[PDB]
Design a protein around this ligand. Structure first.
Ligand code: CLA
Ligand code: CLA
Ligand code: CLA
Ligand code: CLA
Ligand code: CLA
Ligand code: CLA
Ligand code: CLA
Ligand SMILES: CCCCCCCCCCCCCCCC(=O)OC[C@H](COP(=O)(O)OC[C@@H](O)CO)OC(=O)CCCCCCCCCCCCCCC
Ligand SMILES: CC1=C(C#C/C(C)=C/C=C/C(C)=C/C=C/C=C(C)/C=C/C=C(\C)C#CC2=C(C)C[C@@H](O)CC2(C)C)C(C)(C)C[C@H](O)C1
Ligand SMILES: CC1=C(C#C/C(C)=C/C=C/C(C)=C/C=C/C=C(C)/C=C/C=C(\C)C#CC2=C(C)C[C@@H](O)CC2(C)C)C(C)(C)C[C@H](O)C1
Ligand SMILES: CC1=C(C#C/C(C)=C/C=C/C(C)=C/C=C/C=C(C)/C=C/C=C(\C)C#CC2=C(C)C[C@@H](O)CC2(C)C)C(C)(C)C[C@H](O)C1
Lengths: 74, 161, 42, 154, 175, 175, 194, 174
């Protein structure tokens, strides 16, 4: 039982790290917003064009990793 | 034994697991007449339950204090049939599926309409690829060393940063 | 057999449904004849 | 297009060598036909391969009978393993490896022969007919032809 | 041009007759991706270590050093019977010998021949025919020792004894 | 003449070497160097002449410092281990010095020696050329004879266990 | 332009009467989907395996190697009795034979990459028995036919060993008819399981 | 061109009268299957071994070498084989004939090269084949007698497998 939960805790540590690292490393730019750094840290989106850009900011990866942080400490 | 565990063939808690599992089925069988279909169904389940417990006891599995089999996965050879060999079996199938899928996506790139080959699969050619997967470790490593698995970093699109 | 009907059966959802039904089916059959395989027998 | 299982690597967008040697016609007795080096079939051809097998089969006869043959008081010969030859000057190793370690027939209980099958461990040739005929049998022997006769008369 | 070792395959492009143990044998083209001279240096070092290792697995069958006379003749148990001070001294000595390869590889990689650590005290390889023969013989005895040690190691795993002992007792198969 | 008249004569066996009767059915000298094969043949032959002399002598004579085996082949097993090892290393010293430290088929003949010559004629028996030719033929044929004879003497001494002359004076067939 | 084997069907393309044993039999049209070269390679291989296998069953009934591990007249019992180490030796040797005789052109995409490669022709003629080009066509025909017949014959022998727990020749010499009180076909879903 | 021995069959297209013992007898076409020089060498080998075997059967029935009756008792024909395998008699015969057969192998491979007539080991210590007409006649006599002795050997050993008598004793009794 302790083996299984530690691997769940490992899953949640790597997944929270993933969202946060992806937020840090794509903060300056990505392929959707190559100029993402001109808009700041917390901006809503770049609009519905190019397929849709909801939660594209680096702040939004903080937002998404907060759910995974709560899940892991749970 | 290993990690203070007990072989399932001499675990008393394993023995009580088998008995309780059969008493539970026998009291359901006590409510049916001999030749009925519910009696034969439960008599076949008592045979299956006993067979499983017998096989586990004689297999070299180790039981805990709870009387359930535990798997040793540290790499020791006396326990390689619990993870290392099932894992070797898995990776052979997984690399086969990967090699075969990769071979078809490269074929479809040289097609008249490359995206039509991926929603309408050329089944004779895709079956030609699935048969090739049996020697994927040799085929994929030779693919690697011949400079055809890995593309260089400067032919891959990256984000500006 | 009609080539447009065979081109229909070569579509991704049909092959996906058939292959994974065939795949599921020999796992089911393997667990009928050889049940309760927690370990590779060795 | 590509037919499927065609076998040509250029039809499946697979990298080929581009090198496809011409297939010769010369053969060797215990080897195969195919591209060889120049002069290879002249030194390692049928003449080489047949001769080497002939020497290997001749030298098998001492090896299949390998042992320490010693006479007793009369002319009677006793057979022993070559392990009984204790070499004198190799420290802690006193029993040495011999030709019986590369050909350990005895350990597997083989009883090799210079004709490869000795009096003990001989080929077993039985008769499957079990001492009766094809048709019109009586007793514990009922052939398929008898079963056809039994069905036709019933 | 086709490979000598595997006559129906084409010749591996990055190995050459210049190399002492050349047979044209690279079915998986390691030299097509890795440096052929790095691979050449690695094969020679593995062979030199294995040539000593093959003698070492065999030699305490005959005689042991008086201090380790009590130690076992199965090599896989004599490994653990040696004290960590002894293994530390071995590791330090191999480290001192490996400083010369750390200086040859990684600094003057292109100056010399693979495996040439400046160790020719008896001045062999002076005669060119002898040098040619020794180059090829070192490679072939190194490859043979690699195979032979690999055998003897796994044989000590199965039968808990050494090579000669397994042969003498005819313990050739898993009991 | 041709030793095997039905077989074609081997192409590399010209008459220049002594003892050549055109006998090479298996087909050596078509793969190996005839200089190496001839030097090997003389070495085997001269060793076996000394070997048959040793068998006959040791059946009778015994040095006082040594025990005596039942047979000259059991004479090997009562000579101290150090003595056998000293003889082995002494012969090895001779093999190194007489062959100019060139001992392999790749380098033994790269200085231009004729097969079997070590410049050994203290009594000067090979002073005459034609007499040298006759004694070359004598040497190779007596050497070949001593090879077979040594095989016979050793295997009979192993089998009976009663020497060579003792065996003849007490002949006892296989029973 | 109708098939000769099946007169009411059209003659299949990729079957032109060149190959030995070609009589126009491909009703399901596999030759139109799968290259005939691969199909003939696989047919010759299956047939060669089955010639050995049918002969294996019959001779194994009659003649045995010495020892108790080789004393199984019933050939299906020999599978279990024969030393496992040597059986896996056979398997490994077969794999080595498969890679070398095919010259590392093993797969559906690289066998026949050499235009010189011919279906079923591995270069195997140790005694040069196919040296005469006059016998070539009838050898090819009778190899294909022996292979087909032995596929059918071995299939029958295996499933007659399953039904009757008897070796093939002594099943013919001690025949017993099928009672049908055992080995009923199917039925896993008729009784809803168990 | 039709066969001299089997008139309704064709000439076997690999056999020619320059061969010794030719009668056009290859109805099964084996001379087309195997290389003919190999077949010729095999026939003469089978011929000579069977000639020795038939003569040996006859002579062993007539007399027996000194001391042999001790080791070989009621055993005769094939029966003596297992008793003399225990002894080294058959081992020694096998050793020396195998030694000769290594050189026989080299000779056959030269024959297949085409440098030697089949069965020609050049063995004529006493002089019989000096003359060419005598040489050809003896070639035919050797082939014919060897063929007869092959069938003879067959009959003799099978007569032992039936009655246990031996050739001469089967003539004397029944
Ligand atoms: C350099 C000249 C030289 C010297 C000084 C020696 C000295 C010796 N030899 Mg001799 N030997 C030599 C050359 C020499 N050897 C040559 C050239 C040959 C071959 C032609 C031999 C063949 C020979 C035989 C056949 C025997 C000896 C033995 C002995 C030793 C007897 C000691 C004993 O009883 O207890 C010592 C007991 C021990 C267990 C200790 C081992 C002996 C030590 C290691 C001797 C070391 C000598 C040294 C390595 C010189 C050899 C050089 C090499 C080229 C031969 C003695 C020290 C006898 C012997 O060793 O019996 C025991 C014996 O049977 N020798
Ligand atoms: C967490 C790290 C870790 C890792 C990576 C491994 C890795 C391994 N262990 Mg495990 N092990 C671990 C921790 C670990 N162990 C711990 C903490 C213990 C408790 C002390 C064990 C106890 C243990 C035992 C008792 C054994 C292993 C063995 C092995 C090796 C067998 C795998 C193999 O096929 O290789 C080797 C085989 C090949 C390369 C080719 C085979 C075909 C493998 C290298 C086995 C072994 O062979 O040791 C070297 C073995 O007997 N392990
Ligand atoms: C056979 C085709 C194929 C191959 C060779 C790969 C190869 C890879 N993928 Mg996968 N991928 C595939 C299909 C394939 N992908 C498909 C169809 C999807 C959509 C679900 C994905 C989604 C996906 C994600 C989200 C990720 C990868 C990752 C990876 C990498 C690591 C292996 C892994 O995590 O597997 C994981 C595989 C999956 C999660 C899904 C695979 C689903 C099936 C089994 C494969 C498709 C079979 C296909 C229909 C083949 C038909 C062949 C036939 C026509 C002949 C590696 C580059 C990971 C990566 O980048 O790490 C470095 C990663 O994060 N892939
Ligand atoms: C500088 C020279 C030198 C000196 C003074 C020593 C001294 C010693 N060595 Mg070391 N040794 C040396 C060089 C040296 N060695 C070299 C060059 C090697 C080759 C790698 C070794 C390999 C070695 C091994 C393998 C062992 C020793 C051991 C020992 C010790 C004997 C055990 C003891 O005292 O308790 C002793 C301290 C033993 C030890 O440390 O036991 C505790 C031991 O097992 N030595
Ligand atoms: C340290 C010893 C030593 C060394 C370095 C050599 C070196 C050589 N020998 Mg010599 N040889 C030796 C000892 C040695 N010999 C002895 C003791 C004998 C028996 C008297 C011979 C008999 C011999 C013959 C007959 C032939 C050679 C040949 C060769 C050459 C080929 C290299 C090779 O493959 O063998 C290298 C050999 C070794 C590393 C060890 C040799 C040991 C052999 C197997 C003899 C084993 C011992 C013997 C049965 C019993 C001796 C008892 C005695 C010690 C009391 C090379 C010049 C061949 C040659 O030059 O022709 C081309 C050849 O035909 N050798
Ligand atoms: C790497 C070489 C090698 C080695 C060292 C061994 C070693 C062994 N084998 Mg193995 N074997 C090998 C290769 C090898 N095998 C290969 C390549 C095959 C597949 C063709 C086999 C198939 C095999 C079987 C089926 C058996 C063995 C057995 C044995 C063991 C007992 C041997 C014995 O008593 O022999 C002494 C006995 C003999 C020499 C009698 C030989 C009988 C004749 C020669 C068989 C006829 C051969 C037949 C015509 C095959 C033709 C096909 C082939 C050319 C491809 C021994 C451990 C036996 C075993 O597991 O015992 C426990 C066993 O039953 N072997
Ligand atoms: C393999 C066949 C064979 C066997 C088993 C024997 C066995 C025996 N022979 Mg005979 N022998 C044989 C072949 C054989 N011999 C041949 C081919 C000859 C040559 C003609 C002789 C000539 C011969 C003579 C001259 C004598 C023996 C004698 C003996 C006996 C010794 C007492 C012994 C039982 C002796 C004996 O006791 O004769 C009765 C005896 O005097 N043998
Ligand atoms: C080129 C090779 C040619 C091969 C020919 C095959 C010969 C043997 C075929 C069966 C012989 C007679 C059958 C009567 C036997 C029979 O019909 O039994 C009936 C059985 C179902 O049981 P029931 O519902 O009939 O139970 C009836 C009650 O009376 C008893 O409970 O049918 C099956 O489903 C069994 C076959 C498995 C079906 C799936 C097979 C595996 C699928 C693999 C992919 C497809 C392959 C082809 C599938 C058809
Ligand atoms: C460089 C240099 C020089 C030097 C030097 C030195 C120290 C050279 C050292 C050379 C050495 C130690 C060579 C050893 C090679 C060992 C081999 C090939 C063994 C293979 C084992 C096998 C095949 C096996 C096996 C086994 C198997 C698996 C199954 C077993 O049941 C049995 C069995 C035993 C048969 C000097 C000093 C002269 C100076 C010069 O100026 C420069
Ligand atoms: C690759 C492939 C093909 C294929 C194929 C197939 C199916 C090939 C199968 C081949 C087989 C079955 C080979 C069997 C070999 C048996 C051996 C060597 C027995 C050795 C006995 C020994 C050593 C012993 C012993 C002894 C012991 C231990 C103790 C004693 O008490 C008993 C005894 C005395 C006997 C083909 C060619 C068809 C086509 C195509 O190209 C693809
Ligand atoms: C190629 C080549 C050469 C070669 C070679 C070799 C090894 C050639 C061997 C060829 C063989 C083994 C051919 C065997 C064919 C068997 C058949 C057709 C059986 C069919 C059975 C049937 C129909 C049945 C049945 C049955 C049923 C089901 C009911 C049963 O109750 C009974 C029953 C038995 C009646 C060599 C190596 C010499 C070299 C050369 O240079 C090249």
């Amino acid at each position: 039982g302790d083996f299984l939960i530690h691997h769940a805790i490992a899953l949640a540590l790597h997944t929270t790290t993933l969202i946060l690292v992806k937020g840090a490393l794509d903060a300056r730019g990505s392929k959707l917003m190559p100029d993402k750094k001109d808009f700041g840290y917390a901006f809503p989106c770049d609009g519905p064009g190019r397929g849709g850009t909801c939660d594209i900011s680096a702040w939004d990866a903080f937002y998404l990793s907060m759910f995974w942080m709560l899940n892991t400490i749970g | 034994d290993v990690a203070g565990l007990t072989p399932c063939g001499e675990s008393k808690e394993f023995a009580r697991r088998l008995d309780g599992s059969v008493k539970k089925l026998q009291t359901r069988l006590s409510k049916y007449e001999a030749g009925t279909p519910p009696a034969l169904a439960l008599q076949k389940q008592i045979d299956k339950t006993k067979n499983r417990f017998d096989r586990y006891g004689k297999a070299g599995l180790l039981c805990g204090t709870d009387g359930l089999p535990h798997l040793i996965t540290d790499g020791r050879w006396t326990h390689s049939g619990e993870f290392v060999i099932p894992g070797l079996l898995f990776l052979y199938v997984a690399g086969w599926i990967g090699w075969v899928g990769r071979s078809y996506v490269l074929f479809a790139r040289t097609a008249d309409k490359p995206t039509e080959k991926e929603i309408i699969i050329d089944v004779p050619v895709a079956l030609s690829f699935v048969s090739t997967g049996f020697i994927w470790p040799f085929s994929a490593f030779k693919e690697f060393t011949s400079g055809n698995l890995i593309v260089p970093a400067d032919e891959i699109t990256v984000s500006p940063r | 057999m009609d080539s447009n009907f065979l081109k229909y059966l070569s579509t991704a959802p049909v092959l996906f449904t058939v292959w994974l039904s065939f795949t599921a089916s020999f796992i089911i059959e393997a667990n009928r004849f050889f049940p309760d395989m927690l370990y590779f027998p060795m | 297009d590509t037919t499927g299982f065609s076998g040509v690597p250029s039809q499946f967008a697979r990298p080929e060598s581009g090198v496809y040697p011409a297939e010769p016609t010369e053969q060797t007795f215990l080897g195969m036909r195919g591209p060889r080096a120049p002069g290879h079939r002249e030194n390692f051809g049928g003449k080489h391969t047949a001769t080497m097998l002939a020497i290997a089969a001749l030298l098998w006869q001492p090896v299949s009978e390998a042992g320490m043959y010693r006479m007793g008081a009369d002319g009677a010969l006793t057979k022993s393993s070559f392990s009984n030859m204790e070499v004198p000057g190799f420290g802690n190793m006193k029993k040495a490896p011999t030709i019986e370690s590369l050909f350990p027939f005895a350990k597997n209980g083989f009883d090799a022969s210079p004709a490869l099958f000795g009096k003990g461990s001989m080929i077993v040739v039985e008769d499957p007919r079990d001492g009766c005929g094809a048709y019109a049998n009586s007793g514990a022997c009922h052939t398929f032809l008898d079963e056809i006769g039994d069905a036709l008369k019933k | 041009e086709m490979s000598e070792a595997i006559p129906f395959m084409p010749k591996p492009a990055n190995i050459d007759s210049s190399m002492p143990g050349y047979a044209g044998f690279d079915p998986l083209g390691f030299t097509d991706y890795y440096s052929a001279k790095w691979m050449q240096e690695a094969e020679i070092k593995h062979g030199r270590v294995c040539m000593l290792a093959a003698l070492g697995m065999v030699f305490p069958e005959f005689a042991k050093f008086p201090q380790f006379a009590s130690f076992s003749t199965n090599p896989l148990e004599a490994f653990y019977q040696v004290s960590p001070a002894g293994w530390g001294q071995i590791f330090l000595f191999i480290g001192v010998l490996e400083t010369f390869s750390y200086e040859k590889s990684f600094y003057n990689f292109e100056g010399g021949a693979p495996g040439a650590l400046g160790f020719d005290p008896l001045r062999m390889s002076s005669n060119p025919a002898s040098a040619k023969q020794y180059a090829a013989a070192e490679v072939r005895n190194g490859r043979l020792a690699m195979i032979g040690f690999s055998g003897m190691l796994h044989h000590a795993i199965v039968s808990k004894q050494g090579p000669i002992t397994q042969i003498v007792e005819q313990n050739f198969y898993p009991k | 003449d041709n030793a095997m008249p039905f077989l074609e004569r081997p192409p590399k066996l010209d008459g220049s070497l002594a003892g050549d009767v055109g006998f090479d059915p298996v087909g050596f000298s078509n793969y190996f160097d005839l200089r190496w094969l001839r030097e090997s043949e003389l070495k085997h032959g001269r060793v076996c002449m000394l070997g048959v002399t040793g068998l006959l002598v040791q059946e009778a004579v015994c040095l006082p410092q040594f025990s005596n085996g039942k047979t000259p082949v059991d004479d090997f097993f009562v000579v101290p281990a150090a003595g056998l090892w000293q003889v082995f290393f002494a012969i090895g010293a001779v093999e190194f010095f007489s062959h100019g430290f060139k001992l392999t088929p790749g380098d033994m003949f790269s200085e231009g020696r004729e097969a079997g010559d070590f410049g050994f004629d203290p009594l000067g028996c090979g002073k005459n050329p034609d007499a040298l030719a006759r004694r070359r033929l004598v040497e190779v044929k007596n050497g070949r004879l001593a090879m077979i004879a040594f095989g016979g003497l050793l295997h009979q001494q192993l089998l009976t266990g009663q020497g060579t002359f003792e065996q003849l004076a007490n002949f006892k067939a296989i029973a | 332009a109708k098939s000769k084997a099946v007169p009411f069907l059209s003659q299949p393309e990729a079957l032109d009467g060149s190959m030995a044993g070609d009589v126009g039999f491909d009703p399901f049209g596999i030759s139109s989907v799968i290259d005939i070269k691969w199909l003939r390679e696989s047919e010759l291989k299956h047939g060669r395996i089955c010639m050995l296998a049918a002969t294996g069953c019959l001779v194994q009934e009659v003649v045995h190697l010495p020892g108790p591990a080789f004393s199984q007249k019933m050939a299906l019992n020999a599978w279990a009795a024969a030393p496992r180490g040597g059986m896996i030796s056979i398997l490994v040797a077969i794999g080595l034979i498969e890679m070398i005789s095919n010259r590392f052109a093993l797969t559906a995409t690289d066998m026949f990459a050499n235009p010189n490669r011919v279906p079923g022709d591995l270069g195997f003629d140790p005694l040069s028995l196919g040296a005469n080009p006059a016998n070539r066509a009838r050898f090819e025909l009778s190899e294909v036919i022996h292979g087909r017949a032995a596929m059918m014959g071995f299939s029958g022998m295996v499933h007659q060993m399953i039904v009757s727990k008897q070796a093939p020749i002594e099943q013919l010499m001690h025949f017993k008819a099928v009672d049908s009180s055992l080995m009923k076909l199917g039925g896993a879903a008729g009784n809803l399981g168990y | 061109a039709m066969s001299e021995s089997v008139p309704f069959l064709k000439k076997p297209e690999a056999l020619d009268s320059s061969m010794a013992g030719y009668a056009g007898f290859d109805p099964l076409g084996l001379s087309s299957i195997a290389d003919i020089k190999f077949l010729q060498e095999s026939e003469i080998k089978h011929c000579r071994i069977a000639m020795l075997a038939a003569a040996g059967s006859i002579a062993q029935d007539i007399f027996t070498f000194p001391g042999v009756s001790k080791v070989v008792g009621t055993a005769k024909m094939t029966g003596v084989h297992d008793v003399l395998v225990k002894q080294g008699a058959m081992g020694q015969i096998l050793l020396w004939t195998s030694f000769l057969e290594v050189f026989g192998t080299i000779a056959l491979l030269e024959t297949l090269d085409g440098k030697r007539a089949p069965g020609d080991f050049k063995f004529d210590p006493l002089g019989f084949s000096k003359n060419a007409e005598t040489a050809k006649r003896y070639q035919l006599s050797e082939i014919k007698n060897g063929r007869l002795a092959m069938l003879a050997t067959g009959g003799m050993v099978h007569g032992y497998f039936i009655t246990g008598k031996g050739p001469l004793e089967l003539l004397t009794n029944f």
